[PDB]
Enzyme design. Structure first.
Site, PDB file in Angstrom:
ATOM      1  N   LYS A  91       0.871  -1.146   0.000  1.00  0.00           N
ATOM      2  CA  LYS A  91       0.000   0.000   0.000  1.00  0.00           C
ATOM      3  C   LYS A  91       0.930   1.223   0.000  1.00  0.00           C
ATOM      4  CE  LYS A  91      -3.795   2.352   2.642  1.00  0.00           C
ATOM      5  NZ  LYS A  91      -3.992   3.162   4.025  1.00  0.00           N
ATOM      6  N   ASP A 146      -2.699  -2.062  13.027  1.00  0.00           N
ATOM      7  CA  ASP A 146      -2.635  -2.896  11.835  1.00  0.00           C
ATOM      8  C   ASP A 146      -3.054  -4.304  12.239  1.00  0.00           C
ATOM      9  OD1 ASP A 146       0.496  -1.729  10.446  1.00  0.00           O
ATOM     10  OD2 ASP A 146      -1.459  -0.770  10.477  1.00  0.00           O
ATOM     11  N   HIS A 192      -5.567   3.755  14.303  1.00  0.00           N
ATOM     12  CA  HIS A 192      -5.902   2.325  14.101  1.00  0.00           C
ATOM     13  C   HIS A 192      -4.692   1.461  14.532  1.00  0.00           C
ATOM     14  CE1 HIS A 192      -3.365   3.297  10.770  1.00  0.00           C
ATOM     15  NE2 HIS A 192      -3.099   2.014  10.668  1.00  0.00           N
TER      16      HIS A 192
END
Ligand SMILES: O=C1C[C@@H](c2ccc(O)cc2)Oc2cc(O)cc(O)c21
Ligand SMILES: O=C(O)CCC(=O)C(=O)O
Ligand SMILES: [Fe+2]
EC number: 1.14.20.4
Length: 348
Positions: free
Chosen positions: A212, A233, A231
């Site tokens: 990504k 992972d 967040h």
């Protein structure tokens, strides 16, 4: 329907960003000038970990390395890796090929546009709203499977620049070896046999490496937005390159710590999938990404993940006791992702 890219919004001549890109007023408190935040040496900082002796033939000096890496993993679960065996030259080829792809017009990137409504997840993309708040983040991305060679759909890889395919798949290749060694040390650190964690996440056979490229355009009101939301992972391990622009922040003892820009290094995250297998010993840290007005930020994140269905992930039997029971019930990779989504879905 309408498609729209942050890169476009960035070049449209806007002084204030749209409402959808502004964080909730509670979250705005914690967002500061990334450049000023970069100049602070006070308080906790992310560890730098030297991997020189990870496979060393002097056991005294190999073991040393394993302990620093373990401590780093138990504490922060994120670190800058130096002396990690990936050529510096090869790291530059990859960034150069990614900077070139993103410097094409949006209209030429659109040819690689992903399509989530038809399950085409790989490609050029930008994150769509996925719960009641219409929040967007200040980034565009490029996402594709990278390793193993046999599972790649090369027809979605950038053909321009010409060096994209070769650079990326030698980097991945190299990253897989590093990951094998990391998993090896992590395994020992935990007291297991050295092959263990790799086969529990899928071995050479089934383990996936996803690339990504996160593309953060300049942002006219950067301190109102995030590049990437808070967040953890889901991966087993994530390896990250960036273009020496600051933005990575880690939520560490109650506060947001900014990562520094170490040249020739690799950010490695411990991910949820290792944290589950390890019963919370190794930490999948919360983190996010800030944008700025001056400089385009780019990062290259490779997520080393298990097969989505096939492996039921759960704490290892070695890793549970009466005194420390399972902290996570059994879930497949896909299930784990869904449980997280489900949780976050609860806006209202
Ligand atoms: O944090 C993420 C982002 C995610 C993703 C981004 C874009 C997209 O189109 C699909 C998936 O991929 C991942 C894959 C991993 O195993 C581990 C991860 O932590 C992640
Ligand atoms: O761009 C960065 O440095 C952060 C990347 C990140 O958290 C992600 O892609 O999951
Ligand atoms: Fe991340």
């Amino acid at each position: 329907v309408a498609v729209e890219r942050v890169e476009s919004l960035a070049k449209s001549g806007i002084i204030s960003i749209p409402k959808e890109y502004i964080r909730p007023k509670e979250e705005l408190e914690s967002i500061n000038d990334v450049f000023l935040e970069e100049k602070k040496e006070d308080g906790p900082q992310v560890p730098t970990i030297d991997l020189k002796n990870i496979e060393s033939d002097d056991e005294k000096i190999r073991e040393n390395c394993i302990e620093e890496l373990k401590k780093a993993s138990l504490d922060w679960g994120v670190m800058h890796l130096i002396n990690h065996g990936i050529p510096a030259d090869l790291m530059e080829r990859v960034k150069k090929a990614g900077e070139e792809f993103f410097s094409l017009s949006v209209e030429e990137k659109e040819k690689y546009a992903n399509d989530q409504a038809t399950g085409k997840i790989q490609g050029y993309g930008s994150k769509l709203a996925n719960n009641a708040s219409g929040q967007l983040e200040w980034e565009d991305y490029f996402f594709h499977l990278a390793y193993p060679e046999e599972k790649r759909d090369l027809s979605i890889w950038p053909k321009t620049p010409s060096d994209y395919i070769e650079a990326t798949s030698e980097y991945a290749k190299c990253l897989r070896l590093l990951a094998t060694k990391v998993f090896k040390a992590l395994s020992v650190g935990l007291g297991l046999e050295p092959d263990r964690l790799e086969k529990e996440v899928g071995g050479l056979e089934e383990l996936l490496l996803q690339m990504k490229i996160n593309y953060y355009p300049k942002c006219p009101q950067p301190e109102l937005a995030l590049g990437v939301e808070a967040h953890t992972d889901v991966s087993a391990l994530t390896f990250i390159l960036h273009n020496m622009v600051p933005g990575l922040q880690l939520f560490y003892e109650g506060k947001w710590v900014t990562a520094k820009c170490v040249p020739d290094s690799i950010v490695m995250h411990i991910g949820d999938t290792l944290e589950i297998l390890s019963n919370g010993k190794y930490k999948s840290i919360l983190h996010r990404g800030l944008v700025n007005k001056e400089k385009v930020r780019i990062s290259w994140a490779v997520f080393c993940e298990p097969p989505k269905d096939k492996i039921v992930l759960k704490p290892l039997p070695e890793m549970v006791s009466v005194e420390s029971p399972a902290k996570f019930p059994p879930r497949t990779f896909a299930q784990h992702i869904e449980h997280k989504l489900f949780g976050k879905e609860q806006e209202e």
